[PDB]
């Protein structure tokens, strides 16, 4: 058998075998060649792996063209990667040369058979039929011994005879079925059968196994005097026979009973027959026997103790049957041919081992057994097989010519312990064994191997920023699966190379599906991202690890109640503070930075603050600070005001905020990953006054072309030219609530005296009335003072100025 041990390779690329096949279409098993004793390895390197196969990569034991027995071990990989069906075949044989079996029947012919002897003749033809039909015709020697009482069947003798012949011989058959042919009829000497059954398979010394097989229905009518006796477990044996015949005829009692010369009581034939059978049973003769109908032995003996007493005929009462009917007795035969049959099987109660390689654990428990052979393995002749800690055991084989088993079971390869490598072969058994009988040497069936192959996973850094101001060049990151605690792997992403790399890895799990990696950035020192929310997502079609790092982001936009556009001269008086606090309390800030309506600040998780500190140049100040929260997973919360702080709602779209005279506030989520938030604030204008100069000479008549020029404190100068109209001229500048401004004639018309006074105008917080001053005193509506009169009608303040012709000395 050293031409078929299968041999073994370890090396860089795993353990496998070396005179190897692979399955069509698949490169990650490597099964072990068949062969046989004379040739070595089969020339078979690549087919289907189809299970149904019964021809292709055996190991075969014996002639090759003919083998004892022939075994395979072989794997295929499932639709599911990493899952392996395995299968093991053995087939069996009828064995060749060796010793034939000797069996002698002992055939009752008694009347009390004779419907007992038509089951008997067909039962002993279909067991000669059955042997012959199996090709073990020349392995059983097959003789007859058939009694009745001297005189009837045997003549004087009371027996015939049917020397041992080969069963298969048809000329054997004949004399057996043509003796067995008469009719039964006569006494039941049973001790004379079982006697000469013995002498007929005593008669050489050959050391084949030697068998009687006692057809009869219990009651013997005719036995040898009894001399000497021995009590055996409570039951009586005779040792020692004189030539003399108890002879009760018609039941098993005898009519005069005696006392032996071991000083014990013969009453009936039964001392006599148990001894006989067992004189039989000690010269090494297997003693069977079927108990046809047993009835009542007249009123002298039950059918239960008679049956009791035909189970020490046998050697033990297992030997013993019981047939109830016609088709009992023919089955019993039938069953004795089957098992004189199954004795030359090349495989008998045979075993296999199979411990699971350590790279494999069982995909599940459950290992089936199947026939698959041309002649058929019942249901209850199959072989036992159970997976337990980590071995598969098979059981109780039984295969003669054509029959063949298959056991299946499945195993999964482990690629997730720290240790595995990829493209490795690894052995799915351990050292697989065929035992085919008891205290024959074992065989080993080839082991397969498999493996799970490397692939390449791609890591993908993406950026989305507010900016598009310098990145880093390179940044670290660390990747993990599932969380396993022993395996990482580092990787440096670099603007270069278009912020992606890759590393290899087992291309599944444990269970066959792709690994669910996770990846996380080391900090640069030389870069703050903080503005950057990190989100991840595997896409196992581009087999892409993505990192997406999403810039957050505040800004805010400035509106007026009244819907008027705002200057770029008002939005210089503007101002607004971004604050940012330590908690969700918002009372302590950290910082505090200005923000114009054109910035969008770059924001990382915390707590702020949004405040107008001041109001564009013609509105009022509402100086309410929004609170609100950017989390650690880029999500806007509305915390309420300093005033009232809340305990922070998610803003979803948008957050309706507090009124602002006629409109609402309002935080809006936009951008297009819900990245920026955006306040909209309102600002409501100041009421205010409108400033009018009517102009007179000093003779009530309107005069043009004066110049008068309004200077707001920190605004921006105006001047106007008076009508020679009633109505006057207006200046265009409001004078708002708040404000200071003063106003003076700064150019005189000609011929006209300048008026260098000095008016003084202060609104009210109202804007909806002032004070006046000139040169420093007070000046009431109504009232005039240094060439000005005053009037105001409700947001209108008026001057009425008198200009006086320059003086000339009269004439
Ligand atoms: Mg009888």
Same mark, same amino acid.
């Given at each position: 058998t050293d031409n078929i041990r299968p041999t073994y390779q370890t090396d860089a690329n795993g353990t496998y075998p070396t005179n190897s096949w692979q399955v069509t279409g698949q490169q990650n098993v490597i099964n072990q060649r068949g062969g046989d004793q004379v040739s070595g390895w089969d020339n078979n390197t690549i087919w289907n792996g189809d299970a149904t196969d019964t021809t292709n990569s055996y190991l075969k034991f014996g002639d090759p063209n003919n083998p004892d027995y022939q075994i395979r071990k072989y794997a295929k990989e499932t639709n599911t990667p990493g899952l392996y069906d395995v299968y093991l075949n053995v087939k069996g044989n009828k064995q060749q040369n060796v010793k034939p079996v000797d069996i002698v029947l002992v055939v009752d012919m008694s009347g009390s058979m004779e419907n007992r002897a038509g089951a008997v003749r067909t039962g002993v033809k279909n067991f000669l039929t059955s042997i012959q039909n199996a090709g073990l015709g020349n392995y059983v020697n097959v003789g007859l011994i058939g009694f009745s009482s001297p005189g009837y069947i045997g003549g004087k003798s009371g027996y015939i005879s049917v020397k041992l012949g080969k069963a298969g011989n048809a000329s054997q058959q004949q004399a057996i079925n043509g003796a067995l042919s008469p009719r039964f009829q006569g006494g039941t000497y049973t001790q004379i059968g079982l006697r000469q059954g013995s002498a007929m398979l005593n008669a050489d010394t050959s050391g084949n196994k030697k068998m009687m097989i006692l057809l009869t229905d219990g009651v013997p009518t005719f036995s040898n005097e009894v001399i000497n006796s021995e009590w055996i477990n409570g039951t009586l044996? =005779?040792?020692?026979?004189?030539?003399?015949?108890?002879?009760? =005829?018609?039941?098993?009692? *005898?009519?005069?009973?005696? %006392?032996?010369?071991?000083?014990?009581?013969?009453?009936?034939?039964?001392?006599? #027959?148990?001894? $006989? !059978?067992?004189?039989?049973?000690?010269?090494?003769?297997?003693?069977?026997?079927?108990?046809?109908?047993?009835?009542?032995?007249?009123?002298?003996?039950t059918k239960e103790k008679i049956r009791q007493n035909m189970q020490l005929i046998t050697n033990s009462p297992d030997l013993y049957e019981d047939a109830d009917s016609a088709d009992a007795v023919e089955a019993y035969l039938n069953n004795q041919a089957k098992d004189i049959i199954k004795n030359f099987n090349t495989v008998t109660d045979g075993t296999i081992t199979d411990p699971i390689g350590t790279q494999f654990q069982y995909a599940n428990n459950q290992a089936t057994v199947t026939s698959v052979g041309k002649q058929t393995v019942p249901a209850s002749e199959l072989p036992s097989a159970a997976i337990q800690d980590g071995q598969l055991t098979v059981n109780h084989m039984n295969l003669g010519q054509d029959?063949?088993?298959?056991?299946?079971?499945?195993?999964?390869?482990?690629?997730?312990?720290?240790?595995?490598?990829?493209?490795?072969?690894?052995?799915?058994?351990? $050292?697989? *064994?065929?035992?085919?009988? @008891?205290?024959? !040497?074992? +065989?080993?069936? =080839?082991?397969?191997?498999?493996? @799970?192959?490397?692939?390449? +996973?791609? +890591?993908?850094k993406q950026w989305r920023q507010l900016s598009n101001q310098s990145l880093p060049d390179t940044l670290n990151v660390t990747v993990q699966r599932k969380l396993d605690p022993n395996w990482q792997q580092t990787l440096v992403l670099k603007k270069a190379d278009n912020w992606k790399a890759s590393f290899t890895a087992p291309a599944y799990n444990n269970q066959g599906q792709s690994f669910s990696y996770v990846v996380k950035s080391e900090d640069a020192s030389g870069i703050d991202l903080s503005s950057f929310i990190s989100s991840q997502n595997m896409d196992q079609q581009t087999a892409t690890l993505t990192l997406t790092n999403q810039q957050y982001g505040f800004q805010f936009q400035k509106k007026t109640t009244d819907g008027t556009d705002l200057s770029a001269d008002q939005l210089k008086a503007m101002q607004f503070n971004l604050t940012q606090y330590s908690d969700n309390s918002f009372q302590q800030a950290s910082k505090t930075n200005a923000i114009t309506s054109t910035d969008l600040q770059a924001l990382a998780p915390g707590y702020y603050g949004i405040q107008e500190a001041a109001?564009? #140049?013609?509105?009022?100040?509402?100086? #309410?600070?929004?609170?609100?929260?950017?989390?650690?997973?880029?999500?806007?919360?509305?915390?309420? &005001?300093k005033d009232n702080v809340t305990s922070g709602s998610v803003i979803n779209g948008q957050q309706t905020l507090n009124p602002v005279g006629d409109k609402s506030d309002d935080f809006t989520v936009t951008g297009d990953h819900q990245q920026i938030l955006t306040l909209t604030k309102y600002d409501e204008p100041k009421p205010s006054m409108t400033?009018?100069?009517?102009?007179?000479?000093?003779?009530?008549?309107?005069?043009?072309? !004066?110049?008068? #020029?309004?200077?707001?404190?920190?605004?921006?100068?105006?001047?106007?030219?008076?009508?020679? &109209?009633?109505?006057?001229?207006?200046? @265009?500048? /409001?004078?708002? !609530?708040?404000? %200071?401004?003063?106003?003076?004639?700064?150019?005189?018309?000609?011929?006209?005296?300048?008026?260098?006074? /000095?008016?003084?105008i202060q609104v009210a917080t109202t804007g909806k009335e002032a004070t006046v001053t000139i040169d420093g005193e007070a000046l009431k509506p109504g009232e005039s003072k240094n060439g000005y009169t005053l009037a105001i009608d409700g947001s209108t303040i008026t001057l009425q100025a008198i200009n006086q012709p320059l003086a000339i000395l009269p004439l």
């Open positions: 044996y =005779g040792t020692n026979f004189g030539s003399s015949r108890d002879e009760p =005829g018609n039941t098993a009692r *005898l009519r005069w009973p005696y %006392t032996d010369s071991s000083g014990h009581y013969i009453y009936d034939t039964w001392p006599a #027959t148990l001894g $006989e !059978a067992k004189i039989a049973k000690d010269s090494g003769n297997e003693v069977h026997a079927l108990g046809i109908q047993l009835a009542d032995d007249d009123h002298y003996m029959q063949e088993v298959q056991i299946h079971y499945q195993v999964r390869i482990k690629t997730e312990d720290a240790g595995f490598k990829p493209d490795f072969w690894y052995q799915m058994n351990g $050292e697989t *064994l065929l035992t085919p009988k @008891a205290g024959a !040497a074992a +065989v080993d069936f =080839g082991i397969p191997s498999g493996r @799970a192959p490397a692939t390449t +996973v791609y +890591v993908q109001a564009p #140049t013609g509105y009022q100040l509402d100086g #309410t600070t929004y609170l609100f929260q950017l989390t650690s997973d880029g999500q806007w919360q509305y915390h309420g &005001t400033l009018r100069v009517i102009k007179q000479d000093n003779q009530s008549q309107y005069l043009a072309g !004066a110049a008068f #020029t309004l200077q707001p404190s920190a605004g921006e100068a105006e001047t106007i030219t008076s009508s020679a &109209t009633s109505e006057g001229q207006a200046f @265009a500048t /409001k004078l708002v !609530a708040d404000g %200071t401004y003063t106003m003076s004639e700064t150019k005189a018309p000609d011929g006209y005296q300048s008026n260098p006074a /000095k008016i003084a």
